[PDB]
Amino acid sequence: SRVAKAPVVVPAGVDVKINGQVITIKGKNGELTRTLNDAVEVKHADNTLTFGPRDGYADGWAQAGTARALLNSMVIGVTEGFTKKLQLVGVGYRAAVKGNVINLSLGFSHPVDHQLPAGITAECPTQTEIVLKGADKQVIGQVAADLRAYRRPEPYKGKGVRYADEVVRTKEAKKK
Amino acid sequence: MKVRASVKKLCRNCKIVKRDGVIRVICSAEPKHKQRQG
Amino acid sequence: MIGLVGKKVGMTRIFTEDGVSIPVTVIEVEANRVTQVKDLANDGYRAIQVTTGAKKANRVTKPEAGHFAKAGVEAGRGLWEFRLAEGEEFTVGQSISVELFADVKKVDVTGTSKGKGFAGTVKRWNFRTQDATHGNSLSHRVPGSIGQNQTPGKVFKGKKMAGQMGNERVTVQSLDVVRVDAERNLLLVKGAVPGATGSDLIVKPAVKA
Amino acid sequence: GKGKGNVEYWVALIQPGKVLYEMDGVPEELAREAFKLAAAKLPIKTTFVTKTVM
Amino acid sequence: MKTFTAKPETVKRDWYVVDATGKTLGRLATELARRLRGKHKAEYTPHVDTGDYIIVLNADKVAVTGNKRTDKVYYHHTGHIGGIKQATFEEMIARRPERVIEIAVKGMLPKGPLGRAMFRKLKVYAGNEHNHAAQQPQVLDI
RNA sequence: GCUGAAAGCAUCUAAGCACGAAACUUGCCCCGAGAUGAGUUCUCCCUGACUCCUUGAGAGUCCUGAAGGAACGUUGAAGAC
RNA sequence: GAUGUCGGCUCAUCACAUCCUGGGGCUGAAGUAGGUCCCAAGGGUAUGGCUGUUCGCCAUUUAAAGUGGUACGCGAGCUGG
RNA sequence: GUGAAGAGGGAAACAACCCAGACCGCCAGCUAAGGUCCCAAAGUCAUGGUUAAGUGGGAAACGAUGUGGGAAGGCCCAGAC
Ligand SMILES: [Mg+2]
Ligand SMILES: [Mg+2]
Ligand SMILES: [Mg+2]
Ligand SMILES: [Mg+2]
Ligand SMILES: [Mg+2]
Ligand SMILES: [Mg+2]
Ligand SMILES: [Mg+2]
Ligand SMILES: [Mg+2]
Ligand SMILES: [Mg+2]
Ligand SMILES: [Mg+2]
Ligand SMILES: [Mg+2]
Ligand SMILES: [Mg+2]
Ligand SMILES: [Mg+2]
Ligand SMILES: [Mg+2]
Ligand SMILES: [Mg+2]
Ligand SMILES: [Mg+2]
Ligand SMILES: [Mg+2]
Ligand SMILES: [Mg+2]
Ligand SMILES: [Mg+2]
Ligand SMILES: [Mg+2]
Ligand SMILES: [Mg+2]
Ligand SMILES: [Mg+2]
Ligand SMILES: [Mg+2]
Ligand SMILES: [Mg+2]
Ligand SMILES: [Mg+2]
Ligand SMILES: [Mg+2]
Ligand SMILES: [Mg+2]
Ligand SMILES: [Zn+2]
């Protein structure tokens, strides 16, 4: 509908390849490639790519809209790149980064080594925070989700990992 | 989680959504409102 | 990896200097001659065939004698096969000795256990007997019931009954290797291995681990 | 056998269209809620009807 | 007089090869069973196996519609009590791909010694290469 | 759960991706090619004549008995046989 | 013109509406220990005193001492209270 | 009405259900119920819809932004949701 009809914008210095239903964006932050659904049609006007449902398929518009959103995210990732910051709120909860291994100390009786995927880069601006960068929104979200699932926020004190954008809703330990 | 044959919206935030052909109520506000149909 | 073929010499003990008596089984693991190498291209699986001991000249039949003479090895008393891991590679005629277990801590010994004959249910499956008295009649050790009733009206497969016990291939796993004396061709494992004295054992490295 | 049984409870056979309960003097939405609550206790499908001239 | 009946010693059987890629399982199997039984011949005879040898290639690329790929369940009882094993279509394709086509066709062929003799004439291959180049199989565009 | 529209938001799903239990398929052990779909690989053995015809994947005579097996005997921590 | 009828012993086998162990949601879940619901049938699942009793009570354990179907399983298997 | 005292075809099997009342023979044709992808004779028939649940091929109150059709109604380019 509205999202499906809203075209993307192709900035300067990015390459847009289209072979069959596979589409490819080579930006400055790297390379990305996605095989869209068969019900999807991507045109040109090589400045604003636009999307339409192919004839003969059911949802059609849903597939077109989801492909448009995917390519919006891909262009953002290859031009500016997505970045997510996580905090470790607790007693002596710490994170370190060695190349592509994030070491978590979370009260476990064993260190937690998390291997970053292919093109995701981690940093520790502070000993209690992680900053993740990458050109794939889905990949970076998956990495952050796994890191949080190491130690989801407690409802009683908010300890554990968390996203910055997250309002950890607490409740006081019951009286009596 | 409430596994009940009749799932309804229990507040302004409860949202009906069907996952895997199963009706569920997901509530951002009160986690007591998490229901599924069974 | 590969194992070896040994003979169960018997069972003894080893007194360690700290006054502990390890009950060990002695295996006469002499040299094993590789008579054949089976590869994927010709056989669909990687294995070696080994022989051990020595057999009577007039009792080695002509086909078996020819099979050994193809490898160029003296006719042993049998033939066993060992599957190969991808890294290892053996050649025909190679004599593999008990020094193969120099750095192996636990082994698996497989052999034919002792044949107890036709063993009843009480021996074979540890069924409990019935009252030796209190009125019992001709049923002091019988299996009792063997089914339900009209439903299912049949006895199920795999039911436990009397039959032949022992005399079958049994593998005792993760036996500690105490001593590996290559100069006398001996392997000493901590524990009891299947079969009677003089039987043939196949000793492989540990697989559980 | 041995005769009929003893009277245990009294029923009122209901045929489609029978207007069971009627209500007046309340707002329409509150009447709907009250009738929903009542119908939840009955073993027959119901519906909400209004007064008409004929 | 008496109606003509085919004589098993004088029947003529041909070799066909069918590439089962992208086809629907059951709709391939009905034609396979038809030609194995010999229902496509003027001299069809119910008590004579007059069918044709058929070689099914690419048995792992057979297709099924709907959710049958992850929801069709092949049950079988080992004969030991409690031994009701089962395997889904995808698991059975992964482990023993040609058994899918074989069961599909064996369910449609008549039950009996002649049915078994008919099913002996079906050659189902997981891959694309087939040994029987000596029999000069014909390309049967089912 | 991630990404994600249908439904400008939202949403674990409708495409796509991830995690997930002593259950399932394996991994461990035993049987197992009568698996009549009767598989594979080594090795060994036998390469003489002659009639008849119902000329058939025919029948028969002479000479020849191979590898091997079986039988018998002494027997076994194998065994009711 | 006969299908032996309670309980006990031996032997079991299946269901899941699960007693334990295994994975989860919510909690009036601080922690330990719970309550409740969802998934799960691989394995395990008391010994005695009383009584003919299954049952129940009681003693003492255990991770648990599951509920059921199987002619209220099982007398051409035993007993006969 | 049927069975009893009625065969035959259909309902998988199925006295009493649907079709139909066996004098005998035929390697002749047309049909009833019921059916025409293979078992298994006959449409992988034509036209237009619906379902995405293996529904079809067991079951209720009740619940639900599944999807299809219809008749309205409310707010809307002083640009509405
Ligand atoms: Mg013995
Ligand atoms: Mg006892
Ligand atoms: Mg006695
Ligand atoms: Mg969105
Ligand atoms: Mg009688
Ligand atoms: Mg359950
Ligand atoms: Mg099971
Ligand atoms: Mg298992
Ligand atoms: Mg008791
Ligand atoms: Mg006493
Ligand atoms: Mg007593
Ligand atoms: Mg009984
Ligand atoms: Mg019982
Ligand atoms: Mg009894
Ligand atoms: Mg008796
Ligand atoms: Mg009996
Ligand atoms: Mg009896
Ligand atoms: Mg008495
Ligand atoms: Mg009468
Ligand atoms: Mg009749
Ligand atoms: Mg009549
Ligand atoms: Mg009839
Ligand atoms: Mg019926
Ligand atoms: Mg019939
Ligand atoms: Mg008549
Ligand atoms: Mg006609
Ligand atoms: Mg037909
Ligand atoms: Zn709510």
Automatic annotation (TrEMBL), chain D:
Included range, full protein: 72 to 125 of 125
Quaternary state and interactors: Part of the 50S ribosomal subunit.
Family: Belongs to the universal ribosomal protein uL16 family.
Encoding gene (name): rplP
Protein name: Large ribosomal subunit protein uL16
Signal sequence region: none
Lineage: superkingdom: Bacteria
UniProt function note: Binds 23S rRNA and is also seen to make contacts with the A and possibly P site tRNAs.
Species this chain originates from: Escherichia coli
